[PDB]
Ligand binder design. Structure first.
Ligand SMILES: Cc1cc(CN(C)C)ccc1-c1cnc(NCc2c(F)ccc3c2CCO3)n2cc(C#N)nc12
Length: 360
């Protein structure tokens, strides 16, 4: 029951590739979201009567930078929100959302960064996925690279998406090699690495911080999709992943009754629990998103149509779909974002337009 209440367009006329509401905003503060596109990050505030108030932007010094992704966290000691952005240059920037100052940056990836994700229980643990075939886990409190997830048995082509499970114990990643790979970060090795990353103070020691080199996933499959897998999210112990085949697939590793934490790296079976089809979304680089409670799933297509699946049903394949269109919204929707209370849905487009849908 969403209604389109407003729209606007950014003056660069370049694609907006990412949008994220700040779910770490304090009580009583207005709902804020960020857009990324061109070499720009922009913050907007949502107000009554559909108003989208423009606040302030961060413009990268490199006019050739192209931001692909962003994610919110908060500064661990001060509680003030932080915004991480990254894109074609392969550089993570940490932005102060109040002043839009770049506080610090992380270099290391060999090519573009395609997605950023923060650990669900630890606001300092930032996951990056890169065109260089690797994932990196960063501790943005001590400014340390904790681990590199790669190798010959890592991804063999550009990594496009990844996601932490609910408790932050494991990561699922996906990309251009058609594969989805599980990486457990609750192993004794990775837990110890995270602890050491917090005890590292370069002014109190002579050593560099040693990163972990993780070369072997804990599960891998190429049997879900037959093309680029450009978005992946956990839904409990299940996985939602999409390709460019007009399909979000709900699946799990192993057979039907196999526990996710009993899965071994040699597991060769998967179980398909359903498929959410849609129309006209066969270009690469389109994300679906879920609300905070994971009751709803949203995806835009390449002609401006929005699909919303109600996941509050007993089984994945029973999901109920509703569609949202506007006669003036005809450009490809790259990503969407629900506000934390799920009352607002924002969609961003290849023509730099922004569309606001309010639950009425
Ligand atoms: C730079 C770019 C140009 C175009 C063509 N113009 C005309 C529209 C299409 C696509 C990308 C493009 C977009 N988004 C990423 N990444 C981020 C990413 C993703 F990884 C997976 C899904 C997803 C996104 C954004 C929205 O969902 N890109 C990466 C490269 C390269 N190389 N090109 C692009």
């Amino acid at each position: 029951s969403f209604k389109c209440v407003n729209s606007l367009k950014e003056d660069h006329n370049q694609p907006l590739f990412g949008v994220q509401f700040n779910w770490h905003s304090k009580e009583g503060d207005p709902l804020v979201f960020a857009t990324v596109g061109s070499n720009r990050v922009t913050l907007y505030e949502c107000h009554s009567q559909g108003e989208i108030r423009l606040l302030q932007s961060y413009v990268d010094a490199d006019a050739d930078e192209n931001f692909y992704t962003c994610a919110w966290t908060y500064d661990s000691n001060t509680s003030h929100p932080l915004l991480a952005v990254a894109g074609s240059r392969g550089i993570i920037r940490i932005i102060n959302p109040i002043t839009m100052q770049c506080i610090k940056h992380y270099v290391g990836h060999g090519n573009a960064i395609n997605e950023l994700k923060f650990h669900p229980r630890d606001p300092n643990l930032l996951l990056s996925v890169s065109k260089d075939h690797a994932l990196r886990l960063w501790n943005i409190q001590t400014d340390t690279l904790v681990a590199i997830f790669g190798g010959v048995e890592g991804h063999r082509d550009e990594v496009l998406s990844a996601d932490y499970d609910l408790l932050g114990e494991k990561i699922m990643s996906c990309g251009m090699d058609h594969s989805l790979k599980l990486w457990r970060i609750n192993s004794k090795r990775m837990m110890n690495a995270i602890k050491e990353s917090y005890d590292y103070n370069p002014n109190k020691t002579n050593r560099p911080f040693i990163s972990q080199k993780i070369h072997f996933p804990d599960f891998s499959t190429r049997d879900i999709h037959r093309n680029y897998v450009d978005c992946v999210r956990w839904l409990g112990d299940l996985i939602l992943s999409k390709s460019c085949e007009n399909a979000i697939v709900c699946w799990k590793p192993g057979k039907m009754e196999d526990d996710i934490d009993k899965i071994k790296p040699s597991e060769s079976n998967v179980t398909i629990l359903g498929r959410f089809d849609y129309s006209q979304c066969d270009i690469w680089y389109m994300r679906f998103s879920m609300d905070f409670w994971q009751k709803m799933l949203a995806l835009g297509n390449q002609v401006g149509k929005l699909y919303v699946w109600d996941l509050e049903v007993e089984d994945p394949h029973k999901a109920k779909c509703t569609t949202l269109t506007h006669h003036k919204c005809g450009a490809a929707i790259r990503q969407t974002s629900f506000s934390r209370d799920s009352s607002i849905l924002i969609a961003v487009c290849d023509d730099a337009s922004i569309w606001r849908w309010d639950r009425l």
